[model samples]
Target: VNSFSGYLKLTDNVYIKNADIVEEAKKVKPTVVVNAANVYLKHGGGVAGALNKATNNAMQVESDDYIATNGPLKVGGSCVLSGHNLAKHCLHVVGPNVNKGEDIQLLKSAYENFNQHEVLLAPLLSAGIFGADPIHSLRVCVDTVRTNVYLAVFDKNLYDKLVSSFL
Candidate 1:
């Protein structure tokens, strides 16, 4: 918690801040780091890209193997993976392209995938190509995450939205 790292305490365990999720996520054990991929499990850009780079492309390689072995994850679905650098597990979830029907619940389904972990490190799930509203994404996460979670809000504008929601 620094000047820019303003932490919002939702529960004794849950927190929100304008921090780098990839960096923090790599340091935690028995943790599930969220990577927002598509149905194909490609770690090409945004959070997926960052995590892939952080893990020396291990995440991406594993993702390819995942699809090769089991095929693609359905939209709003996931596959638990390993070899994510320092991270114990990477929860690779396909995002909901909110441009479709029932994507709100679809987004929530992706967020809900983390319930098995005691510690979660996630950036906003649908903040990229998925086209979800930031407030709505944050709201669903706040209501669903039941672990000791740390969420990253990289944008200053959205960081304010997260902090102000609790104030």
Candidate 2:
């Protein structure tokens, strides 16, 4: 372990479920949690593009980001993927260019670094580019993690709830 107070590892490909995260955290408590799920689906952001009406440049940029695109900067699921820093901590769930189940391992790596029970909040999966289904998204995330309660990112009052929930 390259100890720097705690640990965080970002692997190339991994798929992590919520159950595993909870189990791991049970071993230790009082650490913050941030996890990533593989956003499975790739339809070239067609839906997002249509939503933005790609006939113009400004709309194209905004909508393209809303949808998945050829480049990293262009792909975002409009609602789930935001540039603003809205959490106590952040976790990036990335996958291989042409592989499935790659994100699970990454989640494991990140969990390994966390302390026994760090407060975990917010679970967002970006499937804009891929047009992935919600069922699959939840499947990827829910089984791997455990929290006192899960809330939307915009819930400004979630921090206290998260802390008190487990207490």
Error of 1 at 98 (Å): 1.9
lDDT of 1 at 163: 69
Candidate 2 structure quality by residue, lDDT tens digits, 15-107? 222322322332333123233323332223333222122222333343345445534421221123321222323232332222332343343
- For all candidates, the clash counts are 0, 27
Q: Deviation in angstroms for 10 in model 1? A: 2.3
lDDT of 1 at 101: 48
TM-score for each candidate, following the candidate numbering: 0.86, 0.28
**lDDT (Cα, tens digit) per residue for candidate 1, span 60-117:** 7788888999988887788889835646777877758775544677877887787777
Candidate lDDT scores, in order, read 0.73, 0.31
Name the Cα RMSD for model 2.
13.7
